Write a protein that binds this DNA or RNA. Structure first.
Ligand SMILES: [Mg+2]
Ligand SMILES: [Mg+2]
Ligand SMILES: [Mg+2]
Ligand SMILES: [Mg+2]
Ligand SMILES: [Mg+2]
Ligand SMILES: [Mg+2]
Ligand SMILES: [Mg+2]
Ligand SMILES: [Mg+2]
Ligand SMILES: [Mg+2]
Ligand SMILES: [Mg+2]
Ligand SMILES: [Mg+2]
Ligand SMILES: [Mg+2]
Ligand SMILES: [Mg+2]
Ligand SMILES: [Mg+2]
Ligand SMILES: [Mg+2]
Ligand SMILES: [Mg+2]
Ligand SMILES: [Mg+2]
Ligand SMILES: [Mg+2]
Ligand SMILES: [Mg+2]
Ligand SMILES: [Mg+2]
Ligand SMILES: [Mg+2]
Ligand SMILES: [Mg+2]
Lengths: 101, 326, 116, 305
RNA sequence: UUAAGAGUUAAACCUAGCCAACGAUCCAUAAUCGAUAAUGAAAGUUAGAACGAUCACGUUGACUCUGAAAUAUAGUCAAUAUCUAUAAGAUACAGCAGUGAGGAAUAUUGGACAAUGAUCGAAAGAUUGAUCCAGUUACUUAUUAGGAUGAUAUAUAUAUAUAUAUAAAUUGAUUAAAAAUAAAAUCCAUAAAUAAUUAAAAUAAUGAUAUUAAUUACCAUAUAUUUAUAUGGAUAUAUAUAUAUUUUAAUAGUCCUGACUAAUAUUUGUGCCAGCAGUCGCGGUAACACAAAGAGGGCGAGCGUUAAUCA
RNA sequence: UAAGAA
């Protein structure tokens, strides 16, 4: 699949995604912040090109279900800035992107 | 600090902050850190093991964990390649005086840099500093006693016995060459010119040559054979008894046997693999001085923290030390 | 010293490394108890001077931080300085020679100079 | 999965076969010997590529992956060598094509596994003297020297100070012959900084990244509004990023005390304010704690803060 | 009555109220807190030893005097327990040392008032187990606790890929099975010692610490700005003076290697025994787990373990 | 600036 990534390093916002018995709480992180997440999620992030990520798993911590549900979290529970801007007809500006020109 | 123990084990293959020959081979045969087929703990452990073998191995684990900083520092260019932020995992060690000396190439190792500091051979902007843990701030000038730097960077001074045996061998080879030249100068000239053709101009001898006569072989003179048993223990004797075109009136490597290095000064062997000019220091080698410009930073496509390991290894080590190995 | 209110030195720092607060204190409270006010600090060890700088002729510096306006207030309302504090305040110009003693009573090589 | 893995070379080498009962050898030792080649009677490895320093401002960094771990060369002709079945060193049967067309970026890469570590450029003595003269004699500001020569300002100031120290040392005949030979052999090992080239001149528009900006913040605004760096700076409550470069390119009452003959020290009283001056009461004691504060005296002595 | 309000305490009269399931009353337990310590991402949680703040007590209880302020470490009476002086006596170490006991467990019957304070005195000064120093104790935290080089030993024979042979070569093993650049040897240091000085803590003078730190490796001076060459006192020598000018190192334990959990180079003994174990569990002849050898992985003047706190 | 494991 294709995974949306903000700046090709993290997720756009935060994700609170339930996949069967697994409650994933993912949070985008700053540059230089590592992959501070469950080990299954760490491997998926290593393969997907996510570099900066924080998060926590609640209820079920089954490895297979974590693995499968994190991918629906990445694909379904994310909206890029372009999608939001076009849907709302508004301009979404990244303040840090503009501070450095 | 830790007692240096098996820092150059070939079987372990850890790369040290050192210009050592065994360290050079360990670096050469390494390849990369193999992280495949490993659990996350095993990956982090391997990363920590290798990277702490290089960065600050002489620090105890608890002291390093205390001085470890989660903060990583970078510069944004206002005028593209990805900034390797996590190569700054060990940047905090680079402001230590003992690491600054090694990066300035004023010592062969961080260990030697510690000893140079502890023995009073180092100064920080005037004042003698005897504490390797001393941390430099931007703009600080430090200096080393030039003899210490010359010894770190130079070749080992031979002892009398070893140099005398080497010079015996020198005499034997010189006499063999003289005999060969005298008997058959035709083939010797032919071989000399052919070798001059084969070699590259990079050698100074080729440039000098660019810059038959039977008289040539008449100039070559045999050299008397020396037996060291009678010549042992008398350096003034052997000094005058050795007279060769290259080395004149001194035993091998001991032109002035009162300096702490191979006295006709030549660089130490295997120096070029580790010859790296840091981005955060300005180095003046005539005076054996340096200036600490800034703490090392990461910019797009580059990190000024010199390391033999790739970004993934430092990522895993940083993950290890964030949580104290939890 | 006399009186309930006294300007004196309270010891801080480690063993063999004394530093002091110049404090206005109740006469009965312990030396290192929290005082009425902390008027300043006093480091009794002079600042080291290099041997070449001794050839130049610098004098080692003993560092004193002090709130002058508040110290004059406390002297005004009747607080009584100790002997060491009396010496410190006399050389700061806060107190004059009238606070000197017979033992403490000479040629001036430098003159008390105020800078901004 | 993880086991102990003896760090054998990643490239082929001839391993031990049957060994005489008293050899007592390891494959790692043989691999090192083959990497090093024969040792002279002088204790030298003339046959190893890396034994001797370069002389043409092209660093001779290791390339165990390009050259398949074959580090041997003829010292005079510099032609590659290989260990034949019979224990001699001769020409390779086939020539390597990975050792001729080496990317220019790879030649400045000290370590084969870290693409982000590159050696810096040495400045020629002529350029250093030029910068010293410009700063000290012609009084040109460090900003315009930095722009002219493409060097970061702290590096320019460091060059000025180092050249001053060099001038003193030369006036005192303290730079010995050994020091000059060491300096010139080190100088011929590294690439030379070239002011004119665009890719060899340092970037001059770098500012530290502060914690405040690092967090991503997004604003939803009308589709046509302009939003520039100044508006972004206002949103984050910071100076705009250009004043940071601009500012990086660039009273208390005291009373000195009366000294009299025989007095070994002087008193200087610095004015302070009650409620801000003093050692606080019941402050945290860290002396038995792992983060105890260590400092250094003006004489360089380690002291406890 | 008190300086002063109030069932605060005492007296009189009234009214019938007051508290309580958002927990009264009663019982038990506990000194309390911080810009202090621990921990955590944080909210918080824990501690209340150290630093500081507040309270209470000075063997137990009540009362009284003085005092601005005391149920005072005072006085009276009583209780408890000891000493003698045997009395309308003294003492009560929760002041500093120290002892016995209890306990898993917590130190000197030390030095000085030199510094900072406190008391007395007009001062000279006196006193200070406050305090400052030292002692004991890895209880905690630091810093040091050596760098570079180093796989052989014999022979024979302006160049340089030196080449021949003879010895040997520890444990394991027969090659990806190592121990091991580890040893030894080599070069160069510094610590300690040895001598010279020697500040600073404090000055008007006084230094317990103190065989001080620091500096110099013969001593000064005379110019340069730490490195120099000179002038003069040393210095034995040989024969005033060419010369050199102390000596000099290297000392790590403890746990673990089936998984969780880093530890692949394999072997030996035992045989559901002996034992191991935080959890799963291992041991019945082929034990990666027991007890060991080899090798290996941690942490390191500590390591483990138990008890606990936080997560 | 929130990671889990048997
Ligand atoms: Mg009085
Ligand atoms: Mg394992
Ligand atoms: Mg009333
Ligand atoms: Mg009544
Ligand atoms: Mg109740
Ligand atoms: Mg109680
Ligand atoms: Mg409590
Ligand atoms: Mg307390
Ligand atoms: Mg206590
Ligand atoms: Mg009481
Ligand atoms: Mg008692
Ligand atoms: Mg009582
Ligand atoms: Mg007692
Ligand atoms: Mg007992
Ligand atoms: Mg006193
Ligand atoms: Mg006493
Ligand atoms: Mg054997
Ligand atoms: Mg068995
Ligand atoms: Mg086990
Ligand atoms: Mg066992
Ligand atoms: Mg063993
Ligand atoms: Mg320690």
């Amino acid at each position: 699949k294709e995974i949306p990534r903000y700046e090709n390093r993290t997720i756009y916002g935060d994700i609170d995604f339930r996949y069967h018995g697994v409650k994933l709480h993912l949070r985008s992180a700053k540059p230089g912040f590592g992959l501070r997440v469950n080990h299954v999620i760490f491997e998926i992030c290593e393969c997907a090109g996510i570099k900066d990520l924080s998060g926590k798993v609640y209820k079920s911590r089954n490895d297979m279900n974590i693995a499968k549900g994190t991918i629906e979290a990445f694909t379904k529970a994310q909206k890029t800035l372009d999608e939001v801007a076009l849907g709302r007809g508004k301009k979404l500006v990244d303040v840090r992107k503009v501070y450095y020109s | 600090p830790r007692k240096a123990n098996l820092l150059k084990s070939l079987a372990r293959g850890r790369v040290r902050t050192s210009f050592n020959k065994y360290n050079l081979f360990n670096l050469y045969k390494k390849g990369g850190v193999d992280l495949k087929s490993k659990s996350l703990y095993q990956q982090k452990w391997t990363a920590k093991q290798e990277t702490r073998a290089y960065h600050g191995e002489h620090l105890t684990e608890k002291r390093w964990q205390t001085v470890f900083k989660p903060k990583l520092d970078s510069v944004a260019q206002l005028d593209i390649k990805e900034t390797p932020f996590l190569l700054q995992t060990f940047a905090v060690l680079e402001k230590r005086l003992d690491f600054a000396l090694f990066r300035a190439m004023f010592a062969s190792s961080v260990r030697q840099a510690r000893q140079f500091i502890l023995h009073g051979n180092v100064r920080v902007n005037g004042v003698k500093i005897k504490h390797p843990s001393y941390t430099l701030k931007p703009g600080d000038m430090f200096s080393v006693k030039p003899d210490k730097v010359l010894e770190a960077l130079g070749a080992k001074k031979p002892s009398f016995q070893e140099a005398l045996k080497i010079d015996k061998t020198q005499i034997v080879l010189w006499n063999k060459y003289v005999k060969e030249a005298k008997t058959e100068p035709k083939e010797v000239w032919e071989k000399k010119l052919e070798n001059f053709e084969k070699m590259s101009d990079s050698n100074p001898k080729k440039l000098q040559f660019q810059e038959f006569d039977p008289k040539w072989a008449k100039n070559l003179k045999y050299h008397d054979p020396i037996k060291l048993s009678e010549l042992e223990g008398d350096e003034p004797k052997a000094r005058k008894l050795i007279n060769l075109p290259w080395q004149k009136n001194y035993v091998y490597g001991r032109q002035d046997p009162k300096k702490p290095f191979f006295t006709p000064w030549k660089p130490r062997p295997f120096l070029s693999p580790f010859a790296i000019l840091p981005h955060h220091l300005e180095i003046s080698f005539k005076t054996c001085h340096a200036v600490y410009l800034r703490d090392p930073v990461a910019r797009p496509g580059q990190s000024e923290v010199i390391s033999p390991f790739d970004v993934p290894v430092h990522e895993r080590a940083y993950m290890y030390y964030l949580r104290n190995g939890k | 010293t006399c009186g309930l209110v006294r300007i004196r030195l309270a010891r801080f720092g480690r063993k063999n490394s004394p530093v002091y607060n110049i404090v206005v204190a109740n006469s009965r409270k312990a030396r290192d108890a929290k005082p009425i006010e902390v008027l300043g600090t006093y480091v009794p060890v002079p600042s080291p001077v290099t041997k070449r700088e001794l050839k130049r002729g610098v004098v080692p510096i003993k560092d004193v931080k002090l709130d002058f306006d508040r110290t004059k207030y406390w002297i005004g309302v009747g607080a009584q300085p100790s002997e060491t504090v009396t010496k410190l305040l006399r050389k700061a110009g806060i107190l004059n020679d009238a606070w000197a003693t017979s033992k403490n009573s000479r040629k001036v090589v430098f003159e008390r100079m105020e800078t901004l | 999965f993880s086991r102990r893995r003896i760090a054998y070379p990643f490239y082929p080498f001839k391993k031990l076969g049957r060994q005489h009962p008293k050899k007592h050898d390891t494959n790692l030792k043989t691999a090192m010997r083959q990497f090093l080649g024969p040792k002279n009677y002088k204790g030298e490895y003339v046959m190893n590529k890396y034994f001797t320093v370069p002389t043409n401002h092209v660093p001779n960094y290791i390339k165990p992956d390009l050259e398949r771990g074959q580090s041997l060369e003829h010292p005079v002709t510099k032609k590659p060598l290989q260990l034949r079945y019979d224990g001699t060193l001769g020409p390779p049967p086939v020539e390597n094509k990975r050792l001729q067309n080496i990317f220019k970026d790879r030649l400045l890469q000290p370590f084969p596994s870290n693409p982000h570590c590159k050696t810096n450029y040495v400045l020629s003595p002529q350029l250093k003297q030029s910068i010293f003269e410009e700063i000290t004699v012609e009084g040109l500001s460090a900003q315009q020297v930095s722009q002219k020569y493409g060097l970061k300002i702290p590096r320019v100031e460091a060059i000025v100070k180092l050249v001053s120290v060099e001038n003193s040392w030369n006036r005192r005949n303290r730079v010995s012959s050994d020091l000059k030979t060491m300096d010139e052999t080190l100088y011929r090992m590294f690439p030379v900084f070239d002011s004119d080239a665009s890719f060899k001149r340092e970037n001059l528009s770098e500012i530290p990244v502060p914690q405040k900006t690092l967090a991503s913040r997004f604003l939803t605004i009308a589709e046509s509004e302009p939003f520039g760096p100044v508006d972004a700076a206002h949103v984050l409550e910071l100076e705009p990023a250009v004043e940071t470069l601009r500012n990086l390119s660039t009273n208390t009452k005291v009373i000195y005390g009366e000294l009299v003959e025989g007095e070994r020290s002087q008193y200087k009283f610095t004015n302070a304010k009650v409620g801000k001056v003093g050692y606080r009461y019941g402050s945290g004691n860290r002396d038995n704690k792992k983060d105890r504060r260590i400092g250094f005296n003006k004489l360089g002595q380690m002291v406890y803060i």
